[PDB]
Design a protein around this nucleic acid. Structure first.
Ligand SMILES: [Zn+2]
Ligand SMILES: [Zn+2]
Ligand SMILES: [Zn+2]
Lengths: 815, 89, 31, 219, 198, 256, 32, 70
RNA sequence: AUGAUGUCAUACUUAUCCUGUCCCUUUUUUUUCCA
């Protein structure tokens, strides 16, 4: 009694205050002594714990574990406390939080497995007739969880006794809500009980009560969704009065009957679905003018379901449904609601994919030329999605010209920053393909007319359209038009606005990528002297696009620009490496690699060796990366004597730059650097022996990247030679250098093997010093986690001691 | 380029595919290198499913490209280590 | 002021019961 | 879901196929005791493994199912198991769809030293030998052709031995193929002493009396 | 709770491997059993040192680097030093003048000389043992100057051909009391070059 | 919650508070946290009943969380300062009048009003220099203060000066010992404290821009109010060190 | 880097050695 | 460290016992001998022993590694 | 003889990143005065 309650409080404070092993031991002791303490004080201590609002997530998870173990160890001991557990967990059964609802479902499953479903059925039998809506919905959620825990026929005769009885329509409504919630929770598990559920719901499906008939049609629609695509003969019992209820029911009952008809229509026979579609499409034409928003959304969902339903043909749909659909649903009031506009666009794309997108294009070409900006943008997005789905093969040339004029009017009255209609413009013109070659010059003339604007953003959007349309301009290879536009953009190159300049530069990137090499006007030697002062701009997008264009030029066309101008560009890029964007610095590194491939690696390496020792700031790691790319693209055997002599400069950062470029270069080249291991051995040994431990950190990065690179090539002797400095250097303090030590140790354990690492770790893990022994133990634990496969073979021979048998006879038992 | 905080899940990778944004595109998910991106990233959980759909498994931008393990990390086979999508703690 | 003397009111409230208005959490159309 | 504890440790287990193929049970093997039981109201039928009639081996080696294979027909399923001696014992199933009652383990054929045995249909029974020749067998009789005694799970005993099922003739099936394997190749001696197009390599292999040196010469 | 150094000497087969503080460990017998193998390494002594590992040199200067023989045979250092000295004698006005108008010829010797230096003239270095521990020293104890063996300077300046002038005195004294394990070949233990004994 | 009226309904003869008849019951967690807060206060016994002090803190209609101001008054005095503070922090309308435009003039007057140690001492200086200023509208106009609500605050100060003999607490003051005034303020404000995180609610704190300590985020700060508008905001903070915080409600306090 | 042999003192900056001029205390200690 | 690495096999510190580390090493050696096909065949064909008997011996030796602890 | 230890500036690391925030309402007890 009192001692049992004190022990329950002691185990509760040990669970909620001690270590989690002590909490697991307390949970095991509670599961052992649940029968000793009884379910009385267990419930009277768990329901305050369940009702505590400030409990932690781990605390309530441990409470769920304790309740599950106590339920498994007690079973029917909490049979009088079924009602207390039900009134505690009925907020948990109707919990709006998903994790709390899952925990409540698990607790309901534990209670059904422990106590029994008959006590819960006797508890919910007065609650089945709950006239209150929230109490009936909580009872519906609890009964759905109980039916999921105990199965369908554990309560299906009780449900057939309750729902078929006419005691109260609130009891019938609550029971059909239980049926619908259980079918939604089960899904495919309601397939063997499809005829049973149809016979249970056929009594309420023709009920004179509007709410009972509505919840019966909702449960029929939920069963048709859950048992897809089985139970067609089960659901065919209410197939004939569904068409009568589509004419008889009004309002919410009509919406529920239409939803049940739309859910039962794709599971029916094709002649029956065709006849029912022809019957209900006349009502759906009358349902197009539904003023309620939720009713209009349900009707549009029914239209989408009928479009997804096969066997309703395409010509009949396009003649019957689609001009009233474009008359009623394609309106500005439906387009203003963004959920309704997106549902309308998705339904129109699905219908266009079902019955051809040419009819939707010919019916939405005027709505693309509608003056409303958001409505015209939604229409143009729908036409773009229909063109991406079907294509432009069904589009005639006159309709294509009308669509081109409509989207040009949209680009004229494109007031907002709408790049989605720019992408749709590119999509429709790319789907047109070679057919836009008659359409090219008036589009180019209008774009050049918009490029004379007072507004910067208008000319910016025109240059973005040029960047989008360069590929489709060069599909037909209009070389004279492309060269003329290149000359006009060469005149446009003196723009004073940076976003316009970046758009022009991206357009030139596209144009150079799509023309071909010996066919642009002006040529590369007539362009890169013009491009040379452009790189002195301070704007980031201009710098990014210009460096990308220089990357494409130095990739392809090395045969027009002198190496004097190439290393002048390198002199500009040395100042340009201090940009904030790592993508800009990465593309700068790429241009350095292209120029090193082009002009030769001597003067660029001398320039970078001058620059790297001179920077000494919050930069120049990208200079080491660029030096690594100059070496790797152009045979690092040439570069390595210069870098090795530059290591002999005592200037306190140039050696760090040499080692950083060495680590980056070894990571870049991988297995090709096996011959240079003997060359990089004494420099790495001196950097590990250096007093400045940042040099030892970057040499540890060198060792890590070399062990990443040339594993499997006999470099393990030199790796062990460097590890003879690395493993003495495990006395580091800073997190950067100790992370470098950990990474180099992991790389060396990968490279040489686990046996030498075990020989190092086993002689240090038994140290008397706690910190050194724990550090070597953590290193050994990381090595064992990495190499647990061969650790049994690499384990040393230990004799059997007095504690247990340790000399393994399985090794001696050899066949 | 890493941090001592911000562990990801340390949970075993499943069918939810990793996804990279543009701000840190092309880097490895572990060592942040760029050499031979070999193995697709799986992020083990609702790290893809739900609210973080099509998002970065690194810093948090709009995820546009498939995240890849590099061949240097799959040399020691760090691709089996689990989810690399950052959960802030 | 002690530990079990702050839980006798919670034990009495658990013995009495819980009302739907006593913390009416608004939730509808749940799935 | 279910947790059936056993005091004896399970060296191996064979599961009876549920549904129309029999009960949804499992037979955990031990020393001369195959406990067949199902997750539910089923009896733990301890079928005794039928020892040889006056077996010259010592009784420390308990008869356990080293290799077990459930060869199923359209409705029922027989169970061919090898003891510590390794004789092929076909077992019936008189469960009668209520509980594990009888598993008539009769030694249908004497089997050699096999690492594993799998008995498919249409005259297929591949017994992989640890040493010697792996046997692929074709079915001749119905599988119950036992010249030795039958130890059913419902067959009573004195709780000290089983049905004295001695080494029976191979009447149930005939090993149509005996593919000799060089494993476990212990010793080797390769020389061109013999007159052949390639040298003879004698790999000495096998265990006990089932041991041989295979001299192979190519060409 | 622990045994002394004489008890550890009696219990273990390697009494020299029994450290002063390793007997104060939780498992000193297991530590001695792990340390008794021939493939074990000691702890670096910065755990016992107040001074940090390779930090307290503080009063010395060192040569930066010595290039390998193939790199010195290619000779990048000479024109690299010439370019560096020309850059030093340049003014900064001349520096951005040469930035805006560059010039040819950085080194531009050839390619296959550097290729053969990396591959054909590649020499493997002297990699040390698996159990080497580096410390503040660990680069100077190369005498193990063999005991009982002279040096090359003692062979050259005293006129000892490959006969020392103190060989009769060393043979008359026999084994010296300083190094009784020393072997003196040619006078005491009847030896090529400088090392005339072991 | 019902933190002002649980004490009043307890002192007006109802012990069956959650069994009391109503149109709709309050949430039980609000009542439970009110009763556990009253346990942490010196107002309830082990049996959950009001003491003589529990009855006397319901003589005055302010919150019990602001009546531990009065219960820390005359512990080591400083009663007048914290009684003024308990009067002026019971305002309904918010203090200070910062309109559209002007901005910098009101900000400079408010910065002139700033003192270290939270905004309670700042507005205490506001009321102190409003005393012996004629109680004029011109003062609040040039100091950008609403001359409607803090006049009601001095009326509340007059009423709480009048309602002091029933609790039998004098108008003692420590004469500028404002660290001891903050000790009494912290003796009141023990439940509403934070370390960049609340130690009880486990919520990451955010400091309001209208607070006097919006910059210089401290190691230990109490607060008064928990209004979320955009962030988890700390309203009416005060600097502490969790020394005398451990003195008050030690049953509430464990593990720093 | 800069080394003060009269103190055995490291200096990352030249102004550190310039201000290191305690220096005379360890200089008089090394003079003994 | 990591919580999953502590939950992983091979977690150890300076507070980890030598006998506990040897017991974990013996359990890992028995698990590796069970997993390896060649090592189990070498352990089984050494004597006149069955594969299921060797598997039962390995399952017994998994508990026997924690059999006589300290 | 090299340790503890102070916010002292300088150095360096990290392909670290180029940076965010001001409340809709609202009620709450009791005592004296001069020709
Ligand atoms: Zn990587
Ligand atoms: Zn990112
Ligand atoms: Zn994850």
């Amino acid at each position: 009694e009192e001692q049992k309650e004190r022990k329950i409080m002691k185990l509760l404070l040990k669970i909620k205050n001690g270590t989690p092993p002590m909490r697991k031991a307390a949970l095991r002791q509670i599961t052992d002594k649940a029968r000793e303490f009884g379910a009385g004080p267990l419930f009277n201590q768990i329901l305050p714990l369940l009702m505590s609002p400030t409990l932690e997530d781990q605390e309530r998870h441990l409470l769920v574990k304790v309740i599950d173990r106590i339920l498994y160890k007690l079973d029917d001991l909490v049979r009088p406390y079924v009602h207390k557990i039900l009134v505690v967990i009925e907020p948990l059964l109707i919990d709006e939080d998903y994790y709390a609802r899952v925990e409540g479902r698990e607790i309901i499953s534990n209670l059904a497995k422990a106590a029994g479903l008959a006590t819960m059925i006797s508890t919910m039998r007065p609650d089945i007739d709950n006239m209150d809506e929230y109490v009936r919905n909580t009872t519906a959620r609890a009964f759905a969880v109980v039916a999921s825990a105990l199965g369908i026929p554990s309560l299906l005769p009780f449900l057939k006794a309750v729902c078929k009885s006419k005691k109260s329509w609130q009891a019938r409504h609550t029971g059909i809500k239980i049926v619908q919630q259980i079918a939604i929770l089960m899904g495919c598990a309601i397939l063997p009980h499809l005829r049973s559920l149809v016979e249970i719901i056929e009594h309420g499906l023709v009920d004179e009560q509007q709410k009972v008939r509505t919840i019966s049609a909702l449960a029929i629609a939920a069963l048709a969704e859950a048992a897809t695509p089985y139970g067609i003969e089960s659901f065919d019992s209410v197939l004939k009065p569904l068409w009568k209820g589509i004419r008889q029911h009004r309002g919410k009952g009509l919406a529920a009957f239409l939803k049940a008809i739309g859910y039962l229509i794709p599971l029916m026979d094709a002649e029956y679905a065709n006849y029912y579609t022809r019957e209900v499409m006349l009502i759906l034409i009358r349902e197009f003018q539904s003023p309620d928003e939720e009713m209009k959304k349900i009707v549009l969902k029914v239209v989408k379901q009928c479009c997804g339903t096969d066997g309703v043909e395409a010509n009949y749909i396009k003649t019957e449904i689609l001009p009233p659909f474009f008359k009623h649903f394609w309106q500005h009031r439906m387009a203003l609601d963004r959920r309704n506009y997106r549902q309308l666009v998705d339904t129109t794309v699905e219908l266009a994919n079902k019955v051809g997108a040419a009819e939707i294009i010919s019916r939405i070409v005027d709505d693309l030329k509608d003056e409303a900006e958001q409505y015209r943008k939604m229409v143009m997005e729908t036409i773009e999605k229909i063109m991406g789905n079907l294509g432009a093969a069904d589009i005639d040339h006159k309709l294509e010209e009308q669509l081109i004029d409509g989207i040009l009017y949209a680009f004229q009255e494109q007031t907002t920053e709408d790049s989605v209609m720019l992408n749709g413009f590119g999509t429709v013109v790319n789907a047109l393909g070679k057919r836009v070659k008659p359409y090219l010059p008036q589009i180019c003339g209008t774009v050049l007319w918009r490029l004379n604007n007072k507004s910067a953003k208008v000319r910016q959007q025109a240059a973005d359209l040029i960047s989008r349309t360069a590929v489709v301009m060069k599909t037909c290879q209009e070389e004279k038009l492309m060269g003329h536009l290149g000359v006009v953009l060469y005149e446009y190159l003196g723009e004073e606005y940076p976003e316009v300049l970046g758009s022009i530069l991206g357009a030139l990137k596209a144009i150079v990528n799509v023309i071909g090499m010996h066919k642009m006007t002006p040529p590369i030697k007539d362009l890169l002297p013009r491009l040379t002062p452009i790189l002195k701009n301070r704007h980031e997008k201009v710098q990014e696009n210009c460096i990308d264009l220089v990357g494409r030029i130095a990739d392809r066309g090395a045969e027009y620009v002198s190496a004097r101008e190439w290393m002048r560009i390198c002199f500009e890029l040395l100042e340009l490496l201090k940009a904030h964007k790592k993508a800009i610095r990465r593309a700068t590194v790429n241009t350095f690699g292209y120029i090193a491939k082009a002009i030769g690696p001597h003067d660029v390496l001398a320039t970078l060796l001058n620059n790297l020792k001179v920077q000494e700031r919050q930069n120049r790691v990208c200079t080491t990366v660029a030096i690594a790319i100059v070496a790797e693209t152009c045979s690092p055997f040439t570069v390595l004597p210069a870098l090795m002599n530059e290591y002999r400069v005592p200037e306190l950062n140039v050696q760090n730059g040499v080692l950083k470029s060495l680590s980056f270069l070894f990571e870049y080249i991988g297995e090709m650097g096996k011959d240079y291991i003997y060359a990089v051995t004494p420099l790495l040994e001196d950097a590990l022996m250096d007093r400045d431990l940042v040099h030892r950190q970057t040499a540890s990065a060198v060792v890590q990247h070399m062990s990443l690179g040339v594993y499997g090539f006999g470099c393990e002797d030199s790796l062990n030679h460097l590890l003879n400095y690395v493993w003495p250097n495990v006395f580091e303090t800073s997190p950067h250098v100790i992370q470098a030590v950990m990474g180099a140790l992991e790389g060396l354990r990968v490279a040489i093997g686990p046996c030498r690492m075990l020989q190092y770790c086993l002689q240090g893990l038994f140290h008397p010093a706690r910190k050194v022994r724990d550090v070597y133990w953590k290193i050994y634990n990381s090595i064992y986690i990495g190499s647990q496969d061969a650790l049994i073979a690499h384990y040393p021979r230990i004799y059997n001691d007095d504690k247990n048998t340790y000399i393994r006879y399985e090794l001696d038992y050899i066949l | 380029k890493h941090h001592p905080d911000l562990i990801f899940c340390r949970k075993q990778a499943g069918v939810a595919i990793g996804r990279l944004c543009e701000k840190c595109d092309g880097k490895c998910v572990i060592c942040d290198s760029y050499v031979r991106p070999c193995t697709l990233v799986r992020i083990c959980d609702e790290c893809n499913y739900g609210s973080y759909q099509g998002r970065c498994v690194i810093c948090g931008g709009p995820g546009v490209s498939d995240a890849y393990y590099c061949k240097e990390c799959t040399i020691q086979e760090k691709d089996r280590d689990g989810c690399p999508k950052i959960v802030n703690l | 002021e002690a530990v079990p003397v702050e839980a006798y009111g919670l034990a009495m409230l658990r013995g009495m019961g819980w009302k739907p208005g006593e913390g009416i959490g608004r939730t509808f159309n749940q799935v | 879901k279910y947790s059936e504890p056993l005091e004896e440790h399970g060296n191996f287990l064979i599961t009876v196929p549920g549904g129309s193929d029999g009960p949804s049970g499992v037979l955990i093997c031990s020393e001369n005791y195959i406990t067949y039981k199902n997750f539910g109201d089923q009896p733990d039928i301890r079928c005794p493994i039928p020892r040889r009639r006056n077996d010259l081996d010592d009784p420390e080696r308990g008869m356990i199912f080293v290799c077990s294979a459930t060869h199923k027909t359209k409705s029922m399923f027989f169970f061919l198991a090898q003891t510590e001696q390794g004789d092929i014992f076909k077992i019936t199933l008189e469960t009668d769809e209520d509980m594990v009652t009888e598993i008539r383990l009769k030694y249908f054929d004497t089997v050699p030293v096999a690492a594993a045995m799998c008995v498919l249909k249409t005259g297929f029974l591949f017994v992989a030998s640890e040493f010697g020749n792996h046997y692929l067998y074709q079915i001749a009789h119905l599988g119950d052709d036992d010249e030795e005694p039958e130890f059913s799970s419902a067959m009573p005993l004195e709780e000290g031995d089983t049905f004295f099922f001695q080494p029976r003739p191979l009447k149930n099936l005939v090993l149509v193929d005996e593919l000799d394997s060089l494993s476990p190749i212990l010793f080797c001696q390769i020389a061109d002493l013999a007159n052949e197009d390639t040298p003879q390599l004698y790999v000495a292999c096998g265990r006990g009396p089932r041991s041989s040196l295979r001299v192979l010469r190519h060409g | 709770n622990r045994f002394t150094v004489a008890e550890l000497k009696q219990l273990v087969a390697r009494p020299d491997v029994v450290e002063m503080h390793d007997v104060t460990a939780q498992d000193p017998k297991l530590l001695v059993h792990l340390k008794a193998t021939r493939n074990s390494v000691p702890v670096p002594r910065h755990w016992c040192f107040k001074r940090k590992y390779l930090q307290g040199k503080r009063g010395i200067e060192k040569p930066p680097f010595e290039l390998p023989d193939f790199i010195k045979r290619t000779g990048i250092q000479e024109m690299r030093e010439a370019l560096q000295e020309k850059e030093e004698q340049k003014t900064m006005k001349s520096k951005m003048r040469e930035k805006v108008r560059p010039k040819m010829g950085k080194i531009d010797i050839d390619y296959q000389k550097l290729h053969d230096a990396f591959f054909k003239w590649q020499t493997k270095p002297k990699l040390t043992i698996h159990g080497d521990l580096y410390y503040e020293g660990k680069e100077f104890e190369t005498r193990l100057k063999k005991p009982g063996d002279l040096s090359d300077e003692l062979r050259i300046s005293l006129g000892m051909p490959v006969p020392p002038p103190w060989l009769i005195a060393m043979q008359r004294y026999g084994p010296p009391p300083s190094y009784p394990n020393l072997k003196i070949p040619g006078l005491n233990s009847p030896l090529y070059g400088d090392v005339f004994g072991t | 919650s019902l933190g002002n009226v649980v004490l009043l309904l307890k002192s007006l003869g109802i012990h069956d508070l959650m069994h009391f008849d109503f149109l709709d019951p309050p949430p039980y967690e609000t009542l439970l946290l009110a009763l556990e807060q009253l346990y942490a206060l010196g107002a309830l016994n082990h049996l959950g009943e009001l003491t003589t002090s529990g009855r006397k803190m319901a003589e005055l209609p302010v919150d019990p969380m602001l009546s531990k101001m009065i219960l820390a008054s005359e512990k080591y005095s400083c009663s007048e300062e914290i009684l003024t503070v308990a009067a002026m922090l019971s305002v309904n309308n918010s203090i200070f009048y910062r309109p559209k435009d002007k901005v910098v003039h009101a900000d400079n007057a408010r910065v002139n009003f700033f003192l270290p140690g939270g905004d309670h001492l700042v507005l205490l200086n506001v009321y102190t220099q409003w005393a012996e200023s004629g109680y004029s509208s011109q003062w609040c106009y040039e100091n950008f203060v609403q001359f409607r609500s803090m006049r009601r605050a001095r009326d509340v100060r007059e009423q709480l000066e009048g309602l002091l003999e029933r609790v039998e607490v004098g108008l003692s003051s420590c004469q500028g010992d404002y660290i001891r005034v903050r000790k009494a303020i912290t003796a009141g404000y023990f439940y509403h404290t934070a370390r960049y995180r609340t130690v009880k609610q486990q919520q990451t704190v955010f400091i309001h821009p209208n607070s006097s300590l919006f910059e210089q985020q401290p190691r230990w700060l109490l607060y008064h109010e928990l209004v979320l508008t955009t962030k988890e905001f700390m309203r009416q903070v005060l600097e502490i060190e969790s020394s005398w915080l451990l003195e008050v409600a030690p049953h509430y306090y464990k593990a720093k | 880097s800069y080394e003060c042999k009269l103190c055995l003192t490291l200096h990352n900056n030249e102004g550190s050695y310039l201000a290191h001029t305690k220096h005379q205390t360890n200089l008089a200690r090394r003079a003994a | 460290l990591e919580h999953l690495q502590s939950k992983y096999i091979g977690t150890g510190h300076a507070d980890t016992t030598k006998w506990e580390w040897l017991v974990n090493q013996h359990r890992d050696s028995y698990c590796s001998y069970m997993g390896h096909f060649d090592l189990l065949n070498y352990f089984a064909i050494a004597e006149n022993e069955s594969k299921a008997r060797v598997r039962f011996n390995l399952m017994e030796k998994m508990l026997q590694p924690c059999g006589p602890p300290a």
